[PDB]
Design an enzyme around this catalytic site. Structure first.
Site, PDB file in Angstrom:
ATOM      1  N   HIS A  62      -2.350  62.256 -11.716  1.00 34.20           N
ATOM      2  CA  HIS A  62      -3.488  62.260 -10.785  1.00 34.20           C
ATOM      3  C   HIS A  62      -4.494  63.285 -11.296  1.00 34.20           C
ATOM      4  O   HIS A  62      -5.661  63.021 -11.257  1.00 34.20           O
ATOM      5  CB  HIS A  62      -3.058  62.676  -9.387  1.00 34.20           C
ATOM      6  CG  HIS A  62      -1.938  61.831  -8.836  1.00 34.20           C
ATOM      7  ND1 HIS A  62      -2.108  60.484  -8.525  1.00 34.20           N
ATOM      8  CD2 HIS A  62      -0.656  62.124  -8.526  1.00 34.20           C
ATOM      9  CE1 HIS A  62      -0.987  59.997  -8.013  1.00 34.20           C
ATOM     10  NE2 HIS A  62      -0.099  60.972  -7.984  1.00 34.20           N
ATOM     11  N   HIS A  92      -6.102  73.129  -9.925  1.00 35.83           N
ATOM     12  CA  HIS A  92      -6.312  71.862 -10.605  1.00 35.83           C
ATOM     13  C   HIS A  92      -7.796  71.538 -10.433  1.00 35.83           C
ATOM     14  O   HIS A  92      -8.515  72.236  -9.676  1.00 35.83           O
ATOM     15  CB  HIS A  92      -5.493  70.748  -9.932  1.00 35.83           C
ATOM     16  CG  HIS A  92      -5.808  70.566  -8.476  1.00 35.83           C
ATOM     17  ND1 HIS A  92      -5.164  71.258  -7.473  1.00 35.83           N
ATOM     18  CD2 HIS A  92      -6.715  69.773  -7.860  1.00 35.83           C
ATOM     19  CE1 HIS A  92      -5.649  70.878  -6.300  1.00 35.83           C
ATOM     20  NE2 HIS A  92      -6.615  70.000  -6.513  1.00 35.83           N
ATOM     21  N   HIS A  94     -10.926  68.213 -10.150  1.00 30.03           N
ATOM     22  CA  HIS A  94     -11.312  66.792  -9.984  1.00 30.03           C
ATOM     23  C   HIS A  94     -12.596  66.616 -10.795  1.00 30.03           C
ATOM     24  O   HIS A  94     -13.436  67.536 -10.854  1.00 30.03           O
ATOM     25  CB  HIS A  94     -11.620  66.485  -8.484  1.00 30.03           C
ATOM     26  CG  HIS A  94     -10.486  66.868  -7.579  1.00 30.03           C
ATOM     27  ND1 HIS A  94      -9.475  65.986  -7.257  1.00 30.03           N
ATOM     28  CD2 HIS A  94     -10.144  68.062  -7.029  1.00 30.03           C
ATOM     29  CE1 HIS A  94      -8.623  66.585  -6.434  1.00 30.03           C
ATOM     30  NE2 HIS A  94      -8.993  67.852  -6.292  1.00 30.03           N
ATOM     31  N   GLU A 104     -15.822  66.852  -5.300  1.00 36.81           N
ATOM     32  CA  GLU A 104     -15.319  66.283  -4.037  1.00 36.81           C
ATOM     33  C   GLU A 104     -16.244  66.759  -2.909  1.00 36.81           C
ATOM     34  O   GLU A 104     -16.856  65.951  -2.224  1.00 36.81           O
ATOM     35  CB  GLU A 104     -13.885  66.781  -3.840  1.00 36.81           C
ATOM     36  CG  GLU A 104     -12.928  66.096  -4.830  1.00 36.81           C
ATOM     37  CD  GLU A 104     -11.509  66.046  -4.368  1.00 36.81           C
ATOM     38  OE1 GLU A 104     -10.971  67.067  -3.864  1.00 36.81           O
ATOM     39  OE2 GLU A 104     -10.912  64.953  -4.555  1.00 36.81           O
ATOM     40  N   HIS A 117     -10.036  73.628  -7.687  1.00 38.68           N
ATOM     41  CA  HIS A 117      -9.364  73.990  -6.433  1.00 38.68           C
ATOM     42  C   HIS A 117      -8.233  74.972  -6.804  1.00 38.68           C
ATOM     43  O   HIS A 117      -7.306  74.580  -7.568  1.00 38.68           O
ATOM     44  CB  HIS A 117      -8.767  72.699  -5.807  1.00 38.68           C
ATOM     45  CG  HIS A 117      -9.844  71.809  -5.221  1.00 38.68           C
ATOM     46  ND1 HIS A 117      -9.696  70.460  -4.971  1.00 38.68           N
ATOM     47  CD2 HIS A 117     -11.120  72.117  -4.881  1.00 38.68           C
ATOM     48  CE1 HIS A 117     -10.824  69.980  -4.474  1.00 38.68           C
ATOM     49  NE2 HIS A 117     -11.711  70.957  -4.426  1.00 38.68           N
ATOM     50  N   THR A 196      -7.066  67.195  -0.419  1.00 43.36           N
ATOM     51  CA  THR A 196      -7.878  65.999  -0.654  1.00 43.36           C
ATOM     52  C   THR A 196      -7.089  64.924  -1.417  1.00 43.36           C
ATOM     53  O   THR A 196      -7.644  63.853  -1.769  1.00 43.36           O
ATOM     54  CB  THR A 196      -9.151  66.356  -1.444  1.00 43.36           C
ATOM     55  OG1 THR A 196      -8.763  66.784  -2.795  1.00 43.36           O
ATOM     56  CG2 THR A 196      -9.971  67.409  -0.711  1.00 43.36           C
TER      57      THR A 196
HETATM   58 CU    CU Z   1       1.987  60.836  -7.739  1.00 44.70          CU
HETATM   59 ZN    ZN Z   2      -8.051  69.304  -5.292  1.00 43.83          ZN
END
Ligand code: CU
Ligand code: ZN
Ligand code: CL
Ligand code: HG
EC number: 4.2.1.1
Length: 258
Positions: A62, A92, A94, A104, A117, A196
């Site tokens: 992800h 991490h 996005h 985000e 984040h 999120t």
């Molecule tokens: Cu997963």
């Molecule tokens: Zn995040």
């Protein structure tokens, strides 16, 4: 089929497995700078990351998580809107497939190229799993990235990404100093919201810094070379792993600065 960011498993589908997706304090949100109120009762924010101990970097299919040793008070967030002490557990990002999207949170509908984040849990609840059963269990420090000059403190992350290309891969990632990801200013907006990504738990005091960091085009280009798929599967580039803005509902966004 597992949650993700594609047309068949992406943010518009999450609600069927995680009905809280349509809850009362979901994240992210649009930060309307003209209706956020300056709050003089906010104490200054204290980011204390000098004793941080990074352990490992993981591609989880992800995003990638840089994980920390949170078994002692080492890298903590305190002050600002927070009561008590929050311990850093991981960070991490996005990011987008293009520099015009990827964040985000948005600021007056403006999307940044990516968002960092730094996730912390409230050390009155003993550990993370118990913290996420509490409405004030988490604090996430969110930092926007824009494309411009390189961010030197991000390069050790960028350089390790080749080694965790696909879902399930991890690498040793010790002695990484997260202070090198911070902008100069700690002015911020804060509101109550959620993680999120599924399971989208409504436990987060969000602290989103007004000042973005600049990263180079070459640095973000390397984020976009990661893969959502596992090794020996067909390539699905890890891009656009961001959830869009959610209804503000009954919430007020406060600003730390005039
Ligand atoms: Cu997963
Ligand atoms: Zn995040
Ligand atoms: Cl809760
Ligand atoms: Hg919670």
């Amino acid at each position: 089929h597992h949650w993700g960011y594609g047309k068949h498993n992406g943010p518009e589908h999450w609600h069927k497995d995680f009905p809280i997706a349509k809850g009362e304090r979901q994240s992210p949100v649009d930060i309307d700078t003209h209706t956020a109120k300056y709050d003089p009762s906010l104490k200054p924010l204290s980011v204390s990351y000098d004793q941080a101990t990074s352990l490992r970097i993981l591609n989880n299919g992800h995003a990638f998580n840089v994980e920390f040793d949170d078994s002692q008070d080492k890298a903590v967030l305190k002050g600002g809107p927070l009561d008590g002490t929050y311990r850093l557990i991981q960070f991490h990002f996005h990011w987008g497939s293009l520099d015009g999207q990827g964040s985000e949170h948005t600021v007056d509908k403006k999307k940044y190229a990516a968002e960092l984040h730094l996730v912390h849990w409230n050390t009155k609840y003993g550990d993370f799993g118990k913290a996420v059963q509490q409405p004030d269990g988490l604090a996430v420090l969110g930092i926007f990235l824009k494309v411009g000059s390189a961010k030197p403190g991000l390069q050790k992350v960028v350089d390790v990404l080749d080694s965790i290309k696909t879902k399930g891969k991890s690498a040793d990632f010790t002695n990484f100093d997260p202070r090198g990801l911070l902008p100069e200013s700690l002015d911020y907006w804060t509101y109550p919201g959620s993680l999120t990504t599924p399971p989208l738990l409504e436990c987060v005091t969000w602290i989103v810094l007004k000042e973005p960091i600049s990263v180079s085009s070459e640095q973000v280009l390397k984020f976009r070379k990661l893969n959502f798929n596992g090794e020996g599967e067909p390539e699905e580039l890890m891009v656009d792993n961001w959830r869009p803005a959610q209804p503000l509902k009954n919430r007020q966004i406060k600003a730390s600065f005039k």
